[PDB]
Amino acid sequence: DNSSYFPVGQGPEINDMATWNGRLWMTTGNVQYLDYSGAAIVEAVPPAGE
Amino acid sequence: PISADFSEVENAPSFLSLAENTDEVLKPYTGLEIQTIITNIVGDANPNQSRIFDQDRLRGNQYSAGGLVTQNAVSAIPFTNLIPRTIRVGNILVNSANRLQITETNVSEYYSNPIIATKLSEMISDQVKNNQFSTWRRDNTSLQGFNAFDIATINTAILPNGLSLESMLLKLSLLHSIKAMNVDAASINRSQYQVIDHNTVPTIGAPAVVGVNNSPVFGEDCGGNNPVYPFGGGTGAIAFHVTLQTVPDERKSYAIFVPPAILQATSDANEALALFALSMSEWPHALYTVTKQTTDLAGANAGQQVFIPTQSTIHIGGRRVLDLIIPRREIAPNPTTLVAANAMCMVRPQAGPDATAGAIPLAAGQLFNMNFIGAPAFEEWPMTSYLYSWAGRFDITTIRQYMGRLATMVGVKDAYWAAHELNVALSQVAPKMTTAAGGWAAQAANSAQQSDVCYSSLLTVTRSAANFPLANQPAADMRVYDTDPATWNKVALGLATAANLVPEQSMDVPFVVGDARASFWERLQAIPMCIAWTMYYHSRGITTLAWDNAYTDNTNKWLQKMVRNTFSTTQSVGTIIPARYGKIVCNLYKNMFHRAPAYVATSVGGKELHITHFERWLPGGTYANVYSGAGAVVNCFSPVLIPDIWCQYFTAKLPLFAGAFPPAQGQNSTKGFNSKQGLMIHRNQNNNLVAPYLEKFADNSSYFPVGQGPEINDMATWNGRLWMTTGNVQYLDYSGAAIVEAVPPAGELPVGKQIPLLAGENAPIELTNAATTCVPRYSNDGRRIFTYLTTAQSVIPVQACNRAANLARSCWLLSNVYAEPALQALGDEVEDAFDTLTNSSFLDVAKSVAESAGEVPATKALTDLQAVDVSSLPSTSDPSNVLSQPAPLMSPPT
Amino acid sequence: RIFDQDRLRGNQYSAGGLVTQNAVSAIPFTNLIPRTIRVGNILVNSANRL
Amino acid sequence: YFTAKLPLFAGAFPPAQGQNSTKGFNSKQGLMIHRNQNNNLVAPYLEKFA
């Protein structure tokens, strides 16, 4: 129940293997930081691949 | 609950059964009981994702008396706090013609849980006594950055009462309730803007703006950029002191310390100081405003409406001027020079980010010039202007952390929750009803009747009679506790403690304090209060004009008692005592909702008693009454505020006379009670008037005997509702004469407020949105009132009482559900993984602090060793004890 | 006032699902015989034998 | 109307009877509501794998 907005008072859970996979996606040269619908998030983002 | 068949209404509980004392423990009413019924959100959801902007109505299918079904029928949530100062008129937004609402509080000292001096105080007295052997004036007694001569004078002459903290927590809760409007429009109800202005439509996209002193009309701006108190009309004064010596003699006794434990955040602490100063000066310091974009019902014309929060107009009296005594950064000799002072103040106060005009003008961010001995001149600021500047800077999320540190010093859980109960009780408000035949009505735009409003207690809210600042004070509406500066100073420095003051964790702060949903949730907490007060006033038949004159009248001895006992105007042993019949309403609440109201203790001679907000109202107000469709007043009904579907769909258990009319099912529809129930029909000299089966005493009292009034009897009241719900009742004397009270145009009943519809909604039909239970029985001059029908009109209903005929009625098509309580704690909280990684350490360090109130690692056994003459230490000859109440024994005869 | 107590009264349910409130029916019997009948709003002599 | 026995998802909607008309299954049945980034779309209780 945390798929697009986290439920109030809760945040992401520790899970190593998922973080490992996230590093695998990042270490490719063209990662894209978006949300569940595929829209932009409010944080500033690196020029692509940095 | 809604009834399914006549078998269910016939087996409903009697009123006396629900008013019995109940002994069991019960959970607090968080308002989420109503949320899971009128909303998509069962269980949790993020407020952003839920759009509770559209979750602001009761919805359902309705069944008509004629057999048709009206799908997607609707009803407004009755309560609000916003007051329009600019009403839409003729599709064009314009200035309000009517003066603003006001409220008054009776603040005072009362005995609280008994208080006792701490070990730290004993150590201080021993330090002084030991110091007396040496001709050295020395500063052993300094604590937390305060002067040694100050800790000595804060350690003297304790007051028995106890400590409250309640008025402090009121001011904080009112402020929070106002800043909670500042969040995005997606999570405030649409209806909340249109309870009083039914011709406007708010826009979802843009958040509301919270300003100060902006109002167009009746001088509501309190001097604008140059401010004054809205009520007194004056201007305050505030001064900061490193030490108590620089305080002028006229007011060295009223000084308050500002403990270092607040301001410990690396978050701006100059603001936390301002919010400590705000919570002890007089409230309101200015009239807050909520400006919101809105549009015409056609969507055509757009504008910025102005609103006044109901929290911003209630007067909690107190202190115009303050001396705030700031902690010292570095232990040191008292700063005879200035640079020794400023570079050693733990915080150096400065004005907030807003400019002000008038005498002593303040540029934004201006710095206060510190007070110290031998200074060239004394310096102070007006406090209305000092508070005007920070007024835009507070917000919900910072109040949450503030109160989170405040909780660490003193427990604030139960006290805050009770203060929040007072908040809801005094701020939520609803417009008076319009009589009609059908399901909707509203008063003419920008009329005096449109804006007239009432409390959850069915008492009307008073209006101002002249432009602000008000020249003269209104009567008190309710009485609250006060917070003594003296024992505050004692408690903040660990020198004193009480069982209600035990320190708590920052996580214990109740959920409303943080959330953006809090406005909606306050809106939902006032309904059960009206349900309780409504069942109370409707159990007896007394009319509005009759309550209105009751306190004084000499026509009947019973009526004077019946009002004198509902208000809190009694005392014993120097403390407040709860109203005698407020306990009935409290019991009635506990029995219907299976939830316990928040309470606070009063110590009568050391015996604690619980006061609830049901028991602390004061006499003076007019009672709630409906208006005609033309605007003429109607006196004849008992007091009413809300449609009875609210009363009957949200209670776990209910009184019999108030149950819903059952659905048509084949042959059966509705039915009435007869002589087999102990009842009997009234007849008079006229042969064309018929009154229902009623009590047998009804035969022998055209006038009630003095010392006596109408008695509870559910079934006769039910029959009275059956006569009323036909479209053509007649309200008359035992003889068929007209009563003195003003009566509705024929066949009309009070009905709930109209609001604009969304696509797919339908308006409520017939009596689906009316009040029905308000059956008059006691006239102003002591007569009974009878509901009559003509003979031919009378035949079907009487047979319905005899169970030989059926009467058609409308109903909601809604089933019954009532949840077990959603949360025990009164605070939301969830383990994170780190909470589990670091569990036990927190669990015992917590308990090791809760017992550690007023403790230090040095014990008397160590500090004895350093003493010169141990036998003469006062801690030896005076072991400390809890002070008794009203006062500790003195001068005993040996 | 049993002058007005001269009918069967009650609610009726239709085959189409509507409810007709305050529906009525006459008490069938009598003994009085008019010898002057109202006709055209104007009262006139009876045409029929006793 | 012509089967001796039938699958549950295909049964007829029940007749109105006094208060009751038709009703739906919830989390007590093992189901749960779908929500997305949009705040103005709601989907029924469905499977948990949904």
**How many beta-carbon pairs under 8 angstroms link A with D?**
11
**C11–B66: do the CB atoms touch at under 8 Å?**
no
Three-state DSSP class for B542?
strand
Q: How far apart are the first and last CA of chain A?
A: 32
Of the candidates D21, D33, D40, which has its C-beta nearest B51's C-beta?
Answer: D40
Taken in order B461, B466, B468, B470, is the CA torsion positive or negative? Answer: negative
Distance from CA of C27 to the nearest CA of B (A): 15
Q: B567, B617 in Cβ contact below 8 A?
A: yes
DSSP letters spanning B229-253: -TTT----EEEEESSGGGS-GGGSS
For B849, counting Cβ atoms within 10 Å of its Cβ (0-12 exposed, 13-18 middle, 19+ buried), the class is: middle
What is the resolution of the experimental data for this entry, in Å? 3.0
For B593, the token pair is 């909702």
Whose CA is closest to B312, among B103, B471, B518?
B103
Residue in the structure block whose two tokens are 């009292």: B701
DSSP structural state of residue B346: S
Cα distance between residue B870 and residue B868, in whole Å: 6
Chain B stretch 59-78, residues whose beta carbon is closer than 8 A to a beta carbon of chain C: 65-68
Inter-helix orientation angle B791-801/B714-725, to 10°: 140
Residues in Cβ contact with B672 at an 8 Å cutoff, skipping those fewer than 6 apart:
B692, B693, B718, B719, B722, B797, B798, B800, B801, B802, B803, B807
- Enumerate long-range contacts of D29-33, CB under 8 Å, 24 or more apart: D32/A1, D33/B40
**How many beta-carbon pairs under 8 angstroms link B with D?**
32
Three-state DSSP class for B848?
helix
For B177, the token pair is 């309730």
**A39–D36: do the CB atoms touch at under 8 Å?**
no
Count how many Cα atoms sit within 13 Å of the Cα of residue C14 in the half-sphere of its side chain. 10
Assess B829–A contact: CB distance below 8 Å, yes or no. Answer: yes
For B302, the token pair is 């757009």
Of the candidates B67, B795, B805, which has its C-beta nearest C19's C-beta?
Answer: B67
One-letter-per-residue 3-state SS of chain A: CCCCCCCCCCCCCCCHHHHHHHHHHHHCCCCCCECCCCCECCCCCCCCCC
Produce one character per residue of B248-275: b if its CB has 16 or more CB atoms within 10 Å, e if not.
Answer: eeeeeeebbbbbbebbeeeeeeebbbbb
DSSP structural state of residue B849: H
Three-state DSSP class for B596?
coil
Produce one character per residue of B213-240: b if its CB has 16 or more CB atoms within 10 Å, e if not.
Answer: bbbebbebbbbeebbbbbbbeebbbbbb
**B830–A9: do the CB atoms touch at under 8 Å?**
yes
One-letter-per-residue 3-state SS of B631-650: CCECCCCCCCCCCHHHHHHC
Three-state DSSP class for B365?
coil
One-letter-per-residue 3-state SS of B697-711: HHHHCCECCCCCCCC
DSSP structural state of residue B840: H
Assess B398–C contact: CB distance below 8 Å, yes or no. Answer: no
H or E stretch at B315: strand B314-315
For B5, the token pair is 């068949």
Cα distance between residue B549 and residue B556, in whole Å: 11
Three-state DSSP class for B481?
strand
**B46–A11: do the CB atoms touch at under 8 Å?**
no
Give the Å distances, CA to CA, from B449 to B191, B579, B629: 19, 32, 11
Whose CA is closest to B741, among B726, B731, B751, B728?
B731
Give the Å distances, CA to CA, from B515 to B80, B183, B188, B275, B310: 18, 10, 12, 19, 20
**What experimental approach yielded this model?**
cryo-EM
Three-state DSSP class for B57?
strand
**D21–B664: do the CB atoms touch at under 8 Å?**
no
Whose CA is closest to B175, among B271, B58, B65, B71?
B271
Of the candidates C10, C13, C19, which has its C-beta nearest B65's C-beta?
Answer: C19
**C18–B66: do the CB atoms touch at under 8 Å?**
yes
Q: Which of A3, A4, A8 to mutate to test the interface with B (most CBs of B within 10 A)?
A: A8
Residue B575: strand pairing partners? B572
Q: B106, B480 in Cβ contact below 8 A?
A: yes
Cα B340 from chain centroid (whole Å): 47
Q: B341, B302 in Cβ contact below 8 A?
A: no
Q: B120, B854 in Cβ contact below 8 A?
A: yes
SS3 content of chain D, % helix, strand, coil (to 5): 10, 20, 70
Q: Which of A2, A4, A6 to mutate to test the interface with D (most CBs of D within 10 A)?
A: A4
DSSP letters spanning B669-737: ------GGGT-EEE--S-SS-BEEEE-GGGGG-SBPPTT------HHHHHHHHHHHHSS--EEE-TTSP
H or E stretch at B496: strand B496-498
One-letter-per-residue 3-state SS of B171-193: HHHHHHHHHHHHCCHHHCCCHHH
Whose CA is closest to B312, among B116, B179, B497?
B179
Residues in Cβ contact with B208 at an 8 Å cutoff, skipping those fewer than 6 apart:
B181, B182, B185, B188, B290, B291, B292
Cα distance between residue B524 and residue B526, in whole Å: 6
Q: Which of B49, B397, B828, B838 to mutate to test the interface with A (most CBs of A within 10 A)?
A: B49
Cα distance between residue B349 and residue B754, in whole Å: 51
Q: B511, B409 in Cβ contact below 8 A?
A: no
For B522, the token pair is 């306050």
Cα distance between residue B318 and residue B167, in whole Å: 10
Whose CA is closest to B36, among B830, B769, B820?
B820
Longest dimension (CA), chain D: 45
Q: B321, B386 in Cβ contact below 8 A?
A: no
Assess B688–C contact: CB distance below 8 Å, yes or no. Answer: yes
Cα distance between residue B153 and residue B245, in whole Å: 12
Q: How many CB atoms lie within 10 A of CB C47?
A: 7
**How many beta-carbon pairs under 8 angstroms link A with B?**
22
Assess B317–D contact: CB distance below 8 Å, yes or no. Answer: no
Q: Which amino acid is at B101?
A: Q
One-letter-per-residue 3-state SS of B291-311: EEEEECCCCCCEEEEEEECHH
DSSP structural state of residue B793: H
Q: C37, C31 in Cβ contact below 8 A?
A: no
Cα distance between residue B854 and residue B143, in whole Å: 13
Residues in Cβ contact with B706 at an 8 Å cutoff, skipping those fewer than 6 apart:
B556, B557, B558
Q: How many CB atoms lie within 10 A of CB B185?
A: 17
Assess B675–A contact: CB distance below 8 Å, yes or no. Answer: no
Cα distance between residue B426 and residue B421, in whole Å: 9
Assess A10–B contact: CB distance below 8 Å, yes or no. Answer: yes
For B132, the token pair is 């007396």
Taken in order D8, D13, D15, D18, is the CA torsion positive or negative? Answer: positive
Phi, psi of B497 (to 5 degrees): -155, 155
Q: B788, B685 in Cβ contact below 8 A?
A: no
**D39–B49: do the CB atoms touch at under 8 Å?**
yes
Assess A15–D contact: CB distance below 8 Å, yes or no. Answer: no
Assess B48–A contact: CB distance below 8 Å, yes or no. Answer: yes
Residue B205: strand pairing partners? none
Broken C–N links (> 2.5 Å) in chain A, after residues? none
Q: How many CB atoms lie within 10 A of CB B29?
A: 22
Q: Which amino acid is at B96?
A: S
Cα distance between residue B872 and residue B691, in whole Å: 87
